[PDB]
Structure 1
């Protein structure tokens, strides 16, 4: 129902905001050439957010929501970071490179479970999720959707 979607979307948006902590951790580790989950302490679990985790190799962030939001196994959103292949007049986007000093601006793309390709502006597509998200796009903000 439209009303049920409203409840879920509000809570999913809160989860995405709470994941700012992880986006900052990934950026700090990228700036120092460290594994991207290094030093990251996720905030307390809430009634709506079960966990926020960082992939140490790619910097992808997985947000798992509680059953208040979506069923188990259909409850995860993924945020994918990328950088331009070169800062000046890029021709493509590339996944983060573990161990490399990368202090430039990171672009994050949100993927819900039904989003089958990257949809970023110039310089083009970002990487796909490593672990696939499972949250239905209808429950997520529009830029996470197919």
Structure 2
């Protein structure tokens, strides 16, 4: 139902906003050449957000929502980071490189369960998720959907 959809979408948006903490930790670790999850302490769990975690190798952020939002096994949303191949007039985006000092702006792409390819402006596609998201796209912001 549309009202049910509203409740879930609002709570998913809040989880995405809480994940700013992880986007900042990934940026800090990229700037120091550290594993991307190093030192990250996720915010307190809420009634809506079960966990926020960072993949130490790729910087991918996975947000797991509670059953108030979506069923177990259908409850994850992912954010994938990338950087341009070169800062000046890039021709492509690339996944982050663990151990390399990377201080430029990181672009984050959201993927819900239905999204089968990257959809970004120039310089083009970013990486796909490392761990597949499972949250139904209809519950996520439109930029996360197929």
- When normalised by structure 1's length, the TM-score is 1.00
Q: Secondary structure at the match of 1:79?
A: strand
1:22-47 C-alpha deviation (Å, 9 max, x unpaired): 00000000000000000100001000
**Deviation string, structure 1 residues 104-131 (Cα, Å, up to 9, x no partner):** 0000000000000000000000000010
Residues in 1 aligned to 2:43 and 2:128: alpha-carbon distance in whole angstroms? 26
CA deviation digits over 1:54-107, x for unaligned, max 9?
000000000000000000000000000000000000000000000000000000
SS across alignment from 2:97: coil
Give the match for residue 88 of structure 1.
Answer: 88
- The number of equivalent residue pairs is 146
Quote the residue 1:31 is aligned against: 31
User: Structure 2, unaligned stretches of length 5 or more?
Assistant: none
- Give, in whole Å, the separation in 1 of the partners of 2:19 and 2:74: 18
Q: Which ranges of structure 1 fall in alignment gaps of 5 or more residues?
A: none
Q: CA RMSD in A?
A: 0.2
TM-score by length of 2: 1.00
Secondary structure at 1:56 match in 2: coil
Find runs of 4+ consecutive structure 1 residues off by over 2 angstroms. none
